[PDB]
Design a protein around this ligand. Sequence first.
Ligand code: GTP
Lengths: 80, 75, 241, 69, 660, 82
Amino acid sequence: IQVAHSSRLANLIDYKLRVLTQDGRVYIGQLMAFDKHMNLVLNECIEERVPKIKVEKRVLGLTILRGEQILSTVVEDKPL
Amino acid sequence: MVPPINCIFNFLQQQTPVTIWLFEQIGIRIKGKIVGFDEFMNVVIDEAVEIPVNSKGTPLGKILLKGDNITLITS
Amino acid sequence: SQDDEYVKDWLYDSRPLEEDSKKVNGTSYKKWSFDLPEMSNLYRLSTPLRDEVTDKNYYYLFDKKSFFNGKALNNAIPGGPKFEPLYPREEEEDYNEFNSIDRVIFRVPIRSEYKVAFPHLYNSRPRSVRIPWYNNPVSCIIQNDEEYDTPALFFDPSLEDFAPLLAEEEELILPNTKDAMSLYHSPFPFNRTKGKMVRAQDVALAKKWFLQHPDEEYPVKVKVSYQKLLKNYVLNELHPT
Amino acid sequence: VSTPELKKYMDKKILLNINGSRKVAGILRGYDIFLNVVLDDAMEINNHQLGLQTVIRGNSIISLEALDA
Amino acid sequence: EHTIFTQLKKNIPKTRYNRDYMLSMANIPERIINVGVIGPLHSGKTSLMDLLVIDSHKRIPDMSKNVELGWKPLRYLDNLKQEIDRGLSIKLNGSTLLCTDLESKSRMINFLDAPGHVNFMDETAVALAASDLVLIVIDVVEGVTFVVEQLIKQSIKNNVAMCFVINKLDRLILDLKLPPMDAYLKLNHIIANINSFTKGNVFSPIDNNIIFASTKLGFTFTIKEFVSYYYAHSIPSSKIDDFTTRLWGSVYYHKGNFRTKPFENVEKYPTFVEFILIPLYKIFSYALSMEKDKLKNLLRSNFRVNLSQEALQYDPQPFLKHVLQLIFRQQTGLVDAITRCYQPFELFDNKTAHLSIPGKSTPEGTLWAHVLKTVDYGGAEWSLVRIYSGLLKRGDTVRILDTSQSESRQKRQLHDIEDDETPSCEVEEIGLLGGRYVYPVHEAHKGQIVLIKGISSAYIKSATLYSVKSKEDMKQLKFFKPLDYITEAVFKIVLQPLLPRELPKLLDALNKISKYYPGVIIKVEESGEHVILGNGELYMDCLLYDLRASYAKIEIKISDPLTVFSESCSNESFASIPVSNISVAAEPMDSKMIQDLSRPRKLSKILRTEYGWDSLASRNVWSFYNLINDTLPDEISPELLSKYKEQIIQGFYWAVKEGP
Amino acid sequence: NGIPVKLLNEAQGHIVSLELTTGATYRGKLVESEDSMNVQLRDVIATEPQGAVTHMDQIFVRGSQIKFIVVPDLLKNAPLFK
RNA sequence: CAGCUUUACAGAUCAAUGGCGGAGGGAGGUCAACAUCAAGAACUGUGGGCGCCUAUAGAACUUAUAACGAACAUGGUUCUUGCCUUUUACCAGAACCAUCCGGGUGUUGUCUCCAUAGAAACAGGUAAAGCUGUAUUUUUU
Ligand SMILES: Nc1nc2c(ncn2[C@@H]2O[C@H](COP(=O)(O)OP(=O)(O)OP(=O)(O)O)[C@@H](O)[C@H]2O)c(=O)[nH]1
């Protein structure tokens, strides 16, 4: 995985982002929009859930992820 | 319309039997009479009694139950 | 120096505005852009010639369109011009049951004023008749006694560490603003403050007067002349070369 | 800032889904900006009733499904 | 080619929002607003519409340089040669615009810029019928004329959200040169007048129903919008609504951090004047007058807006307009206001009921749509239809009923309470009336207006089209009543063609006129003389022009403008005179009663009693139309010959139509 | 103001999906939202973590207990973004 | 008084990546040459789908009481008129047409008058300009 040395979250808009959540699920998708309270809009979102063995996958689409439930956000890939 | 604050006030005025349910805790309940009122749901409640839920009674004195951990009010 | 402060230096020069300035394109003298006060001064100066009615509704049945309609219908608006009729008056009704004096009623006299106003209605068999305008009224009051924002001619109605926007302005109406306002409502020549240059030939200072309704208590000859001028104008307008 | 628009649900029986997989029932009487419900008391989910009139706190509410359409 | 015009091809003005999104939105109801903008003559509704269109779109071909600059108005929706050349909006040529609110989210809006002039009030009526909200635009100067009042009344009658637009502030700012305080006072007065004419709902600039517009200079604003733009930086989020509320109603600032209802001695003017009107005035004066650099600096500072280097060299009025645009951003405030006004969608049902009858809702069972007005939008006939429920697909086989055959149908239904499909048509092509272009679409969904091509030929004026799949469904259905074109027509122009040879052509033209101009009765009399009963002079003239140029191109004779007279009686009938190969009396009704009429037997009787305090027997006997018909002899209650009098009453109708 | 909130508001009308902290997914016509994500829906299904579906008419949901909201792909196209 | 983006700055290792790059004028002439300015409200290409749709885009000028002119002449042709009786020279209207006096826009080319730099961002400072900010139930206590 490769990515530019970014300064802020707003500066890396429309990059393919992995997003970890408190329940255990991993939402991968392109960051369309952000919030003051870390709510993320994701372009072509895919939920990856790991039950207690192997990654179970679910395609979503346009999604509004709330900030409360997010643990952290990793850059999966660049735009396009 | 009857607001929650108004209801609380009414209850206070009455001094009738009240049964409070605790937040994030199913097995335990409280039963007393509302004495106090605050800007939040926090209220002081004399003659309180702890109750284990039927999935009877236990000894308990005078208490102020904090607003954050309330679930139910009734009076 | 007091009234005509800005214009005096250049007004009477061969090239009306100097070469090598920011007010005209340059020595080619093809375009001009003016500041406000100079423009205002010019307007003030031109009071004799530019004497135009700022009210657009004034020209009711003195429109080019109206004139054209009149010409078509062989119907003189009494003030305005008259022409040879487009169509020869083929008086061949033959006493038919339509438009008879047995049939119709004469409460209204159906003046030829009304013909050019609703051509397609009041006139029967209209031909090559253009459509006229049908307008709003112009409440526009200009102060002649050197005063600022006053309800003069009309009547009154019956009944956190910050300030409003444009605070520290200290004055609603700037000293030049009355003039600006006046300019605003005035017609084409002065309305603007930038333009392409027309030839001295291509300016018309007489035109405006003859377009207007003639000033009353003039002699017959003058009226006739005015009419002639109008006719000349109208014909030119009509046939676009 | 904005009031919860529950004027459609006024004087209707609502299944209030609350914290810890619990449930409450009753007709809706009132509300406020914090989503503290005021409702006439009914049974807790076989089934058994407590109280006459009840006032539920906002934080505890998971959902409130309308029984009456 | 054509002289009376539309776009005629798919090089349409491209739009800042994408049209696909709009189409999608139109699928779902609750996210469609039929606005139908209305007012008096030259209030500037059309100007407003044009502005809106401009805001929506990228680069429009019709909009020249001059119009762009500001100079000439882009009168967009008066696309007809006549409506151009004449200066009047004459026909309903509205728009379908995805318009955003203060809440960034966006909704599709079927505007309809009606005529202002009082002889095309049929058009206005049609618009009202179509539209669920109605923007009542008013000339600030002219104020609330009688016309405005009438419009308001009409709106009230046919249940609609009245979101006002007080238009032409420029006139008071600059033309009149009213002081800011004076202007404010004037505005207040206008508002008061509006309120008075209205029954109950109190309109003010707070609550976002009044909208302050100057559509030549190119800005509309509700105070809320203004606040959002320019009193967010200073004032925190808690008290913004509060601040807005404070602004208008005779409160002051007190040179101090909180406002006070009393008058204060140090400061002069109210909050509205201080926080809005004064600012506007300043903007105006500076634009006209101030040194340009200074103005630019101010803009940079206060409004946070930059003038382009090109825009500095502009001419005065244009410059001013530009400045206004920069300040008052692309008109979303108006949209927001509209939305606020039409946040109740419970009115919709009421409106529907008014249109037709107290209805039992049956959405899934069938599609139905009020065909409102026929139109010659793009030369070819379209039909302006509001799909009320269901979805109207392209190439669908659809039953239609002209409102002529509505009452009869209803009666039949009642009586009933076999498949009798009387006429029907196929939908050729559906399109959105987008001012000068018809953007074409395949579907057409509930609560939106559209142009449909196939319908026109069935009906004459105002149809109801529907596509049922059952007997029960049919029973459930109702049929829109004929549009009460508020202005009744009494301007009688008689025709004859000058060449009898082309009488068919003339007839065709007449038919077309009837279809298009709804406020047009066309009596074909016995003498071979066609008669047009138009609304007024100007309207009549327009109609003639349309006929004698566009829908015929024929030499046509025309009478002096007469009126429809109507026979009556002053005193009561004295002689009891029968007729043979019946004896009926005559007496005038009560003036008040007549007026009431102009604006179940027991119930009827009661009503009569309430009205005139007549005898009960008379009431019982009564059964009227168009006026009054009783059956009050002695032996009729015993007799069965006089009983069953519907047929008899039919005869009377003829008499009423054609008097002595 | 919150752009996700705005998006949600825009989605009003559409068949949105909606999961909670409890993990109980809903899918239906969005009716109304607020600054805090106080959603309402119509004609809505309700599936638990187990998988057993349960249909229901009118549901209101509180933003705190909401996990994430799936909007249809149409609102990706336009127009509140830019 | 925080944050990021740009200039004005040293001395850098200078990779990394961007952006200003085959980096080199500006103002104008009563100076040219060409193009083009009345048409389905009307523009031009580009591929793709196959003379037409769908995306790309571009677009200087002129236009709605419709025009390059907020300006107005003269011809020619027919037809009708008028003074008239021969014609020119005329009257005044119509329909086509032309001529002319002008106008833009764009592209070059020139003529004149003023002028002259071939490389700067990164770690972050110093200074100044653009926007955002001011723990008790729904986000982060
Ligand atoms: N002073 C001023 N004039 C305006 C304003 N808006 C429009 N006008 C002018 O006044 C007239 C009104 O504009 P229109 O759009 O033609 O009026 P309208 O709404 O079409 O009126 P209808 O033809 O009856 O529909 C036009 O001549 C405009 O130039 C305004 O805000 N201020």
